[PDB]
Every structure is written in structure tokens, then in C-alpha cells.
Amino acid sequence: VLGKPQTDPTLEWFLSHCHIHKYPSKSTLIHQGEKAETLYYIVKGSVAVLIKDEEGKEMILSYLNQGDFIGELGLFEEGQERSAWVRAKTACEVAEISYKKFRQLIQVNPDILMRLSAQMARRLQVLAEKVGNLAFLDVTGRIAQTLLNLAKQPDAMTHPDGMQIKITRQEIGQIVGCSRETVGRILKMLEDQNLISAHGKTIVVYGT
Amino acid sequence: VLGKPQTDPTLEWFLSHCHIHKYPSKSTLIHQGEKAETLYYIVKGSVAVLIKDEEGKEMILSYLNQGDFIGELGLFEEGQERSAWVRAKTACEVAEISYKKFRQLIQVNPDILMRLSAQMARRLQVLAEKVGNLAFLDVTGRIAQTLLNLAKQPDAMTHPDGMQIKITRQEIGQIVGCSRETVGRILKMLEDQNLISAHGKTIVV
Ligand SMILES: Nc1ncnc2c1ncn2C1O[C@@H]2COP(=O)(O)O[C@H]2[C@H]1O
Numbered sequence: 001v002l003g004k005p006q007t008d009p010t011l012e013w014f015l016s017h018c019h020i021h022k023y024p025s026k027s028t029l030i031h032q033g034e035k036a037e038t039l040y041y042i043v044k045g046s047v048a049v050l051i052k053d054e055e056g057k058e059m060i061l062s063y064l065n066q067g068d069f070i071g072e073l074g075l076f077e078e079g080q081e082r083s084a085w086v087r088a089k090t091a092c093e094v095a096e097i098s099y100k101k102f103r104q105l106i107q108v109n110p111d112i113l114m115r116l117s118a119q120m121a122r123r124l125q126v127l128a129e130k131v132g133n134l135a136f137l138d139v140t141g142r143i144a145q146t147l148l149n150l151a152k153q154p155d156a157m158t159h160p161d162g163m164q165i166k167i168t169r170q171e172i173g174q175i176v177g178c179s180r181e182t183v184g185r186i187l188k189m190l191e192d193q194n195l196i197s198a199h200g201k202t203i204v205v206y207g208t
Numbered sequence: 209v210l211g212k213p214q215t216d217p218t219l220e221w222f223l224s225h226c227h228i229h230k231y232p233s234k235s236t237l238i239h240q241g242e243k244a245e246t247l248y249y250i251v252k253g254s255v256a257v258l259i260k261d262e263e264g265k266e267m268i269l270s271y272l273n274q275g276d277f278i279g280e281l282g283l284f285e286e287g288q289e290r291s292a293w294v295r296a297k298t299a300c301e302v303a304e305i306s307y308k309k310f311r312q313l314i315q316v317n318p319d320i321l322m323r324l325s326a327q328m329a330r331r332l333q334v335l336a337e338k339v340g341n342l343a344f345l346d347v348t349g350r351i352a353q354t355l356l357n358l359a360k361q362p363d364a365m366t367h368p369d370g371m372q373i374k375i376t377r378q379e380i381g382q383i384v385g386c387s388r389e390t391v392g393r394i395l396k397m398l399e400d401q402n403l404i405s406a407h408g409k410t411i412v413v
């Protein structure tokens with residue numbers, strides 16, 4: 001740890017080879033199907049990784065945040081496509097560099113490949129969990145897990161009745177696979193089970 | 209890039225530091241929950257990567273084959289646990305190595321980390337549509353989609369009425385995350401729906 005701020009010059013070395021660019025909230029950094037030729041690094045902000053179906057429904061594969069790489073999957077063979085959309089959820093600052101350039105950096109210092117790889121490992125772990133949720137739990141179950149997750153981060157909040165979070169009906173729906181209005185119906189149901197206290201900023205009692 | 213008497217120096221080098229053990233079908237290579245300290249590579253055979261619900265219901269994350277690393281997700285951070293179960297589909301020949309050893313190898317030649325990484329990238333790419341479906345489709349939609357997928361595989365046989373496939377009730381269940389019984393019921397519905405013929409094999413449309 002560099003304490004609160006863990007920057008390390010490996011990072012700064014890395015970053016000095018990139019151009020940093022800003023993106024307002026809801027800007028799309030990456031479009032599914034685009035040719036993959038560029039790697040991103042999130043200096044500031046957080047993003048949504050999402051996929052769409054044939055009707056236009058969107059679901060969230062993951063949230064990523066500062067310190068996270070993005071656009072890394074097309075890096076090990078060329079001629080690939082972006083596997084998903086990536087959208088800024090907040091204002092963002094993101095470093096970017098060509099794949100060839102990045103491939104060059106690796107030669108010099110493979111610890112950058114190690115750090116990237118370690119992120120991919122974590123993503124697969126997390127995907128495995130998310131897959132059991134989606135495959136086994138019913139839409140209420142997925143919603144409760146979700147809540148229980150959003151609250152399990154240092155970006156959440158605290159409260160006598162537990163921890164509070166800032167999430168919307170569309171958000172949750174995109175994470176569990178259901179409408180806006182279903183979520184509302186299910187969030188009322190849980191409040192009723194005195195599982196939560198909602199108000200735009202949900203209050204998860206916490207325990208599971 | 210040479211490699212006789214088969215596949216490259218870099219992998220032959222890597223295997224000589226492994227120990228190769230033999231797994232019979234249905235045997236478990238990797239148990240979920242367990243401390244991760246070693247890496248595997250499949251020399252021969254195929255395995256199933258899977259997870260289960262509270263009541264043992266099974267969901268296949270992926271099949272893996274000869275050439276595939278297994279057990280890698282624990283390598284990058286200490287104290288990780290196995291994210292899923294891994295079971296021999298067929299008899300397997302599996303090389304195995306400790307993470308500590310593998311990391312020294314990485315020091316000697318980062319090529320081997322590149323090849324490992326390329327596979328993890330692939331595994332995230334392929335899981336993306338599949339995870340999409342879990343949210344977009346219910347079990348029936350997912351069962352239909354699976355049959356469609358299966359019928360577009362190279363191993364699908366032509367049929368005068370369409371494409372014939374070989375798959376059991378339980379593999380479908382394992383593919384969509386439901387019981388073999390549920391699969392039997394829904395296959396019958398799709399049948400009555402004149403979408404498929406279900407019998408000694410499955411004929412899609
Ligand atoms: N199975 C599903 N059923 C309905 N909406 C879904 C499903 N999977 C993902 N979604 C969606 O997630 C969004 C949540 O908010 P909306 O109701 O505005 O629109 C919804 C669609 O984009």
C-alpha cells in the first residue's frame with residue numbers, strides 16, 4: 001500500500017505512455033463490434049459494461065472503476081471486436097494506448113501484463129458468481145443479492161439500519177434482467193419484509 | 209515457430225516442470241471453495257467447469273479441452289479459493305504445477321503468461337453473450353436457444369427436416385441451469401409446438 005493513494009511509478013510509467021481523455025457521464029467509451037485496437041485505463045470515474053439483446057434490452061456485465069483496465073480483451077490476437085459496450089456512469093478520465101504500443105511496453109516490463117492479467121482473473125471470478133445468481137435465483141433473489149452487493153463497497157454508505165446506496169430502478173433492472181416497474185414492485189415487497197428502506201437512495205439493513 | 213515433435217518449445221518447457229496425472233471420466237479435478245495453490249494444463253481429454261445451487265443443481269460455465277489451462281484464477285492474489293468445480297468429461301491427462309513454480313517460469317519467460325492470459329481473455333469474451341441470455345431469456349427461451357446453438361455446431365448432422373443433434377436431457381439441464389425433468393417437460397412443449405422432434409436424438413425445425 002502507498003496508504004490511501006497507491007499509485008506506484010509502474011502506473012506512472014505506464015500512464016506516461018498514454019493520452020488521457022475526459023468523458024462526461026453517459027458517454028459511450030466503447031461500442032460493441034468496433035474493431036479492438038486500443039487499451040484503456042480508468043484514471044478517475046466509473047463505468048458500466050453492458051450487452052444488448054436484439055430488441056434493445058441492456059444488461060450490465062459489470063461496473064468498473066478507477067484503477068481498472070478496459071478494452072483489454074482484444075489484446076492477444078488482432079482483428080477482434082469489442083465484446084460489449086462500455087459507458088461512463090460518472091464523469092471519467094481514462095488513459096488510452098494502442099495495443100501495439102502496449103504490447104511493446106510488456107516486453108520491457110512484463111509486470112504490466114501481470115497486473116492486467118490479474119484483473120482479467122478477478123473478472124472471471126466475479127462473472128462466475130454473477131452467473132449462478134442469474135441462472136439459479138428468481139428475479140427477486142437476484143435483486144436482493146444485487147442490493148447486498150452495491151452495499152458491500154466502500155462507495156456505499158452507513159446508517160443505523162445498515163448501509164445506504166444510490167441506485168435506480170433501471171440500473172437494478174439492467175443488472176437482474178427485468179423492467180423498471182417490476183423492480184419497483186419487488187422493492188416494495190422487500191421493504192414490506194422489512195429488508196430495506198427505499199427513497200431513491202435505498203437503505204439495505206445488511207446481514208447476508 | 210518450430211516445436212517438434214509437436215507444439216512449440218515454450219509449452220514443452222512448461223510441461224517438463226509439471227507432473228502429469230490421469231483423471232478418469234466423472235472424476236473431480238477441482239473442488240469449489242478450496243484454497244488455490246496450483247495450476248493445471250490439459251494434455252488430453254475434456255473437462256466441465258461448473259457451479260451448483262444450494263441443492264446441487266448444476267450449471268456449466270464452460271467445457272475446456274486439450275491445450276486449456278485450468279485453475280488459473282487463483283494465481284494473481286494470495287488466498288484465493290476455487291471459483292468453480294471442475295470435472296473430467298472424458299478420461300483426462302492433466303499436467304499440474306504449483307503457482308509458486310509457475311511464477312518462476314513466468315520470470316524466465318513471460319511468453320507463458322501471455323498464452324495463459326490469451327485464454328482468460330477468450331473465456332471472458334465467450335461468456336458475454338451467454339451471460340446476456342441468462343438475463344434476456346427464461347428457462348424455455350434458454351432451452352430453445354441451446355438447441356439452436358447445438359444445431360449450428362459443426363457436429364450437427366443434416367436431417368431431411370432440418371438439423372439432428374445428439375445431447376441428453378441432463379446435459380441440456382447443465383447447459384441452462386435446470387433439472388433434467390424440467391428439460392424433458394419443456395422439450396415436450398416445443399415438440400407439441402412443432403419446433404423439434406425429441407427422441408433417440410433431437411431434430412431441430
Ligand atoms: N429479461 C428482461 N426483461 C426485461 N427487461 C430486461 C430483461 N433483461 C434486461 N432488461 C432491461 O433492463 C432495463 C431496466 O429498465 P427499463 O425498464 O427502462 O428497461 C429494461 C431493459 O433494458
Ligand SMILES: Nc1ncnc2c1ncn2[C@@H]1O[C@@H]2COP(=O)(O)O[C@H]2[C@H]1O
Binds near residue numbers: 062071073086332
Ligand atoms: N464479464 C466482464 N466483466 C468485466 N468487464 C468485462 C466483462 N466482459 C467484458 N468486459 C469488458 O468490456 C470491454 C469491451 O471491449 P473489449 O472486449 O475489447 O474489452 C472488454 C473488457 O474491458
Ligand SMILES: Nc1ncnc2c1ncn2[C@@H]1O[C@@H]2COP(=O)(O)O[C@H]2[C@H]1O
Binds near residue numbers: 238257269277331332
Ligand atoms: N467463465 C469461465 N470460462 C472458462 N473457464 C472458467 C470460467 N470460470 C472459471 N473457469 C475455471 O475453472 C477453475 C476453477 O478454479 P479456479 O478458480 O482456480 O480457476 C478456474 C478456471 O480454470
